[PDB]
Amino acid sequence: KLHKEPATLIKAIDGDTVKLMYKGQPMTFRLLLVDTPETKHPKKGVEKYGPEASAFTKKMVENAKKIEVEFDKGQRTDKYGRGLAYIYADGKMVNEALVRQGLAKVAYVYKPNNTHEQHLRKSEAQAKKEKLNIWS
Ligand SMILES: Cc1cn([C@H]2C[C@H](OP(=O)(O)O)[C@@H](COP(=O)(O)O)O2)c(=O)[nH]c1=O
Ligand SMILES: [Co+2]
């Protein structure tokens, strides 16, 4: 099945991208199955709820005692060299926490890297029926 491995926070970049020390190497990790509003790129840019999604991920990983990464069963990095994982901060999955708050939408679902897709879609449906943030 999937397994969690330890990692150490270096820096949170924005809502869905964080830099971590993993097995002794610095890497940027991109959260599987979600897309947060942009803070960066001019062909996207500071989007509504981008500042709040970044701050939520930053708060969540900086205050954690333990960060764990869980790779899915397909490729572990994307075309930019970013690690593709589910990230956990004291056992809470950051990717699901964002979707549950309406600060991310379920996106980039590429098989076989989709083990938690239904769990995330269930949380996104709840954030939409509660009209949270993106969905308000
Ligand atoms: C989440 C994810 C993104 N990506 C790619 C798709 C997009 O490519 P392009 O940049 O060509 O559009 C980009 C989205 O990342 P960001 O949302 O960080 O921009 O990263 C993957 O290749 N695999 C993944 O699992
Ligand atoms: Co994004």
Side-chain angles (χ1 to χ4, degrees), residues 2-136:
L2 301 191
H3 65 314
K4 294 173 187 53
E5 294 177 70
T8 300
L9 208 222
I10 291 178
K11 184 184 187 292
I13 295 308
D14 70 348
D16 53 25
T17 301
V18 297
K19 296 187 184 287
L20 308 175
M21 197 70 81
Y22 173 65
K23 300 301 88 91
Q25 49 261 315
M27 298 185 64
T28 132
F29 274 82
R30 171 62 169 81
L31 297 188
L32 280 168
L33 301 179
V34 303
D35 189 23
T36 47
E38 190 66 62
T39 32
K40 250 69 77 182
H41 197 9
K43 303 189 295 178
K44 286 284 194 176
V46 196
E47 298 180 327
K48 185 50 190 161
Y49 296 105
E52 5 302 282
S54 308
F56 185 95
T57 300
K58 187 178 196 289
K59 255 77 287 296
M60 188 159 185
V61 302
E62 284 177 351
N63 290 145
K65 308 186 246 181
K66 288 148 66 161
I67 297 307
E68 292 166 294
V69 304
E70 174 184 67
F71 290 106
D72 210 326
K73 64 221 182 189
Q75 49 268 80
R76 276 53 166 154
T77 57
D78 66 11
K79 64 190 177 188
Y80 299 101
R82 302 185 294 183
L84 293 178
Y86 302 111
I87 303 310
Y88 295 84
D90 295 318
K92 284 258 301 179
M93 201 201 290
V94 180
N95 319 42
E96 189 272 333
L98 288 164
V99 170
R100 178 60 179 93
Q101 294 293 311
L103 293 171
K105 70 148 183 170
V106 172
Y108 298 121
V109 182
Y110 301 129
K111 275 162 288 302
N113 276 351
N114 69 329
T115 295
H116 299 319
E117 176 187 7
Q118 291 327 123
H119 178 72
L120 295 190
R121 283 190 188 292
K122 160 277 297 159
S123 296
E124 185 187 60
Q126 189 67 46
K128 304 204 202 73
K129 63 190 67 144
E130 301 182 358
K131 296 87 188 174
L132 288 172
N133 293 303
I134 279 170
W135 305 117
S136 62

